[PDB]
Amino acid sequence: PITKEEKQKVIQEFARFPGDTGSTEVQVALLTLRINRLSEHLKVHKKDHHSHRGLLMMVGQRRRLLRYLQREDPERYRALIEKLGIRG
Amino acid sequence: KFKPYTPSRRFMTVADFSEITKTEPEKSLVKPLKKTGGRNNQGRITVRFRGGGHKRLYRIIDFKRWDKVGIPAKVAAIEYDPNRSARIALLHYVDGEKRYIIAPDGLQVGQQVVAGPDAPIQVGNALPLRFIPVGTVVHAVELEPKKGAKLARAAGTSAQIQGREGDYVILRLPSGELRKVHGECYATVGAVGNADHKNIVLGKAGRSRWLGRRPHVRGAAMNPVDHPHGGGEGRAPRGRPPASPWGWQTKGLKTRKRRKPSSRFIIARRKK
RNA sequence: AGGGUGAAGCUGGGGUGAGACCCAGUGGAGGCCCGAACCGGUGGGGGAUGCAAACCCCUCGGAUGAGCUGGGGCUAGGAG
RNA sequence: AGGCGGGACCUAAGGUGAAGCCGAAAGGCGUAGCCGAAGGGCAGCCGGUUAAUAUUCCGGCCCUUCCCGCAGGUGCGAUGGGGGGACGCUCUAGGCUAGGGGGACCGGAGCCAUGGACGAGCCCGGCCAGAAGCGCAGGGUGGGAGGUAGGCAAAUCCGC
RNA sequence: CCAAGGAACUCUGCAAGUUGGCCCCGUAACUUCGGGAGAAGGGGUGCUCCCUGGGGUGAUGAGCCCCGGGGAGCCGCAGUGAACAGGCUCUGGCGACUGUUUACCAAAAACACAGCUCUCUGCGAACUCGUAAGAGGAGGUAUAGGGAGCGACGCUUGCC
RNA sequence: AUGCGCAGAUACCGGGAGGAACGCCGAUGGCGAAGGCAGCCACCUGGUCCACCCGUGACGCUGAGGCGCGAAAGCGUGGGGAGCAAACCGGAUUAGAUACCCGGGUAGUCCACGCCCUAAACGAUGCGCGCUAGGUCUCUGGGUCUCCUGGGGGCCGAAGCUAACGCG
RNA sequence: CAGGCGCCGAGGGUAGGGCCCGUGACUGGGGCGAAGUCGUAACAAGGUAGCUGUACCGGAAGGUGCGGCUGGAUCACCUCCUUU
C-alpha cells in the first residue's frame, strides 16, 4: 500500500530542484501514482462506487492543475507529460 | 477445465436460445473404455418411445473406492463422456493407474485428494459414511456397503448429511426425502459438478432433441385405435387414462416393498 | 457440382478505473438464402383394353440435416 | 493369376453356442471359444499376342511369405499383461502427379481449289511404366538413470 | 403468331403469358433489431481504338487471370443478343418457423415438436415384452428414467 | 372461533440444522455527493480534522449538456427461505366486509452478476465566498487546556428577514 | 444562312417516402347543467392516522405487504425559555 518512502524518493526524482516540498511537479507525481495503483485495485473489486467516485474527483483535480500547467507554460509541462506517460 | 454454460448462439435463425458449455480440459478421453450396443430395442422385443442415438463413444467409470483406500490421487484433469449429467475428472492414482471419477464441486486439476479409512473431509476425498461429519455434503453415496457407489446423484448435487441413529446415518436425497445407510457404507465427498447444464437451452427441437438421441411421444394421438385415450376428433378424452393400458398419473407403485419402511421417510414431495 | 450470406472467438484502433460497450479487420458458423446430382413428389396437362397393376410433360419444395444413400443385421404379421 | 479378389487370418453389430439360468413338452435366455463384412489386414506394373480371355498368356521391368541349408547376429521363446494400430463433424495452410490448356516448339502425310492467304496457315502427335541411388514436400517425437510400495495377478516391458 | 380490347371468362386470372443472367443508383409499415430485400423502383451491359491502376509466373521482359478506370466512337428495333433464368404490391384466419405421413386422389392441416404444468419411481427404481428364466430399463441412478393435456414467445392463466 | 396435540402437544431437559439478525454497550452520538452505512477480526480504500510553517505559485469558484452513482418495490439467470410475509385459503364480522383481529401459507424478503434511477430524495429549502452580539450544551483535533483555538453537531438566541409563522 | 449534333430544363406521367388536414362502427378517454339510485377514504386518535414510491388483490372510495416522510393524540425519560 501507500509506501511513504519510495514516495518521497520520487517526489524527488521529479521536483527538478531538491527544494520542492510541495509543487505542481509533486501534485503531479502523487495524484498520478495514487491514481494508478488505486485504480488498478478498483479493477479487482468492481464495487466501491463511493471511493471510485472520489478517485474520480481526484483525477479531475490533477488533470486540471495540469490545465494551468499549460496555461502559464506547457513547455516544461510537455516535458512532464513526457516523463510521466499519462495523456498520450 | 471447468466449462461455460450460457454461451448462446444468436439469431442464426430460430437456432435461437441454444446454450453451449465448454469444459476446458478438452482432451479426448483415455485408454479404459468400450461402447454400448444400440439399445432401445432389447432382449430383442422393442420398447419405450423416443430413442435414436447420434454418434458413439461409451463409458466405464469408477464406482468403487476401498480399492486402494488411500493411494492419493491427483486430478489427472477434467473431461467427460457421451453420458452422465455432470462431467468427470479422469484422476491419476499415485501408483500409476488412473480412474474416471465423479467430478464433485469445481475441484482443481492436479489437486490431491483420496479416500478411505479416514480421509480429510475435503470435498473430493471419499469415506465410509461414519466419517460423516454430520451436516456435510457428498453424493455417489452407497447404502449396503460393497454394493458399489449406490445412489450416483447424477449431476445430483444432493447428498445432504442429516444426523445418525443405529448402524445407519440419515440423508436428504435429491428427491426431497431422507433415507438411511449403515455408516460403514460410503460417500463421495462434497457435491456434483453440473446444474446450469440442467438449465441449458436448445434450438429447433427436431434438431436438438433428435441429436439428443430421442425422438418422440404423442398422446391420444387421434386414431386412439390404441393410444389409450380418446381420439377420432378434436376434444381431450375423459376416463382419465394413459398409453399401454395405463393408470393415469396420480397413483402408487410401491407396496410392502419390504424396501420402503426399512428406511427413509419424508415421503415423496417437495415445494419450490 | 456450383454461388451469396454473412454471427462467435480473435487482432488492432476508440472512449473509463480497469471495464462496459463502439468501430474496423479477421472470420467465414447451418439457418442456411440462391440454386442441379440427390430426395420428395402439389399446381396445371397428356393416356384410359395407355411405355406402365401407378406413368410422361410443363411446373414445384428441401437442396447438411430430425439430410440422402450401397452393404451387413434384429423386431412379423391379434405381433410388428 | 505366389504377387487382382475371397478363403487358407481379425472382428462389431450379429447367429451359434462347452458352462450356466430357465418350459407340460417342443423352447426361452447364453459367457467362453467359433461362424459371421468391398468395416480390419496383405506381397506387382506396364507394353505386346488370340474368333474370343488377361496386371491370369508372352515379354521387359519389381517383389511376396513358407520350407532346407548354410553365413553372420542375440536371454531367444507365448499370445496371456501392456503399449499399438483407432477413427466426429465444419473447415482448412503447405506440398506432388491426374488432369486441363498456348507452344509455329520439333517430327510428319498433304493444301492453295474457288477475289484473296502458302503466310508465326491448317491437320496430327509431341508421352507411360522405371530397383533405388538420389533431389523437391512433408507426413507420423523424446535419451537416461533410478525410486519403479500400480503392475495392467507371475519378471527389467507400460504408468505413478 | 396476333390484334382491337385487354378479365369482363371464370366458382377460382386454373392455365399461360408477365417476369426473370451479374454490376452500380436506390429500399417501405413493422421488428424477437437476426429481418423482413432478389422489398420495391432506376440504370447497366455488345463491339472498336485511344490515355490510365492491379492480384500472376524463377527477378520478371512474346509467359496469364481481377477489375480497372476513363475517353472518343462503331453498327442494328433491338447488345444475359440463343439456351440455361423472380411477376409484383396490399391485406386477413391458422400454424410458429425444419419437418413426416396420407405407399393408392387428398403440399397440407394433423401429428412433430423446442419450450409449459400436473404427476409417477427410489434404483435389485416405475413401466414394456416374458411361462418363470430375462431382458429391457440405466453401467442411468431423481437436474434423473416414465404417464401425460399444451405446445416458440409476449401478456395471461380466474369461479366451483 | 381457530388450528394444533392421549398415534402425548402446549411446558422442562439434552442433542441436530440452518436462515436471518446482531442485543447491553450505543447515544438526544459518528462517517458519507446521496443513498445510507454498524458483533469482532484481517485485506485493499476513500472523504476528511488539527499543528510546523517548511513547497508551488492564484492553477481558482460555476457547471447547461453528458458521465458514474444510489432506498425500498420488481424484472433477468444462477444459489438459498429459520422467521417474516401482498397474493391465496381459512376462522372471527356486519345487514356488508374482499380490510382493521386470530388461525394458515406462497411469491418476495437474503447472496452473486446483470437490470430498473424510482420518490414528501427532506432540513419540502443549489452550490462557491466574505460582512453582522451574545448565551448554552456535545464530539472532536492543537495549546500558557479558570479557558482558549480550528473543526463538527442540537439548543437559546439582538439586530434583521417574512403575508405569518418561524429562520436566526 | 438553313439545318444537323449536345445537355438544358416549364411541363405531365408511373413508383415511392415525409409534414400536416380531415377522418372511421367500435373505443380508452377529457369538462361541465340546483334538486340521484350505492358505499364513503380524507380533516376530530374520521373510529386499523395519514401520505407516498412500489408490488399485488377488489362492486367502488381502497386494503394489503416492502421500504420510508411527518404536513401523527397520551403518560414515562432528559436539556433548555420565562416565572408566584
Ligand SMILES: NC[C@@H]1O[C@H](O[C@H]2[C@@H](O)[C@H](O[C@@H]3[C@@H](O)[C@H](N)C[C@H](N)[C@H]3O[C@H]3O[C@H](CN)[C@@H](O)[C@H](O)[C@H]3N)O[C@@H]2CO)[C@H](N)[C@@H](O)[C@@H]1O
Ligand atoms: N367531472 C368532475 C369529476 O367527476 C365528478 O364530478 C361529477 C359528479 O361529482 C357530479 O354529479 C353529481 C353527483 O355527484 C350528485 N350525487 C348528484 C348530482 N345531481 C350530480 O350532478 C350531475 O348531474 C346533474 C343532473 N342535473 C348535473 O346538473 C350536474 O352538472 C352533474 N354534475 O357532477 C360532476 C359531473 O360533471 C366528481 N364529483 C369530481 O370530483 C371530479 O372532478
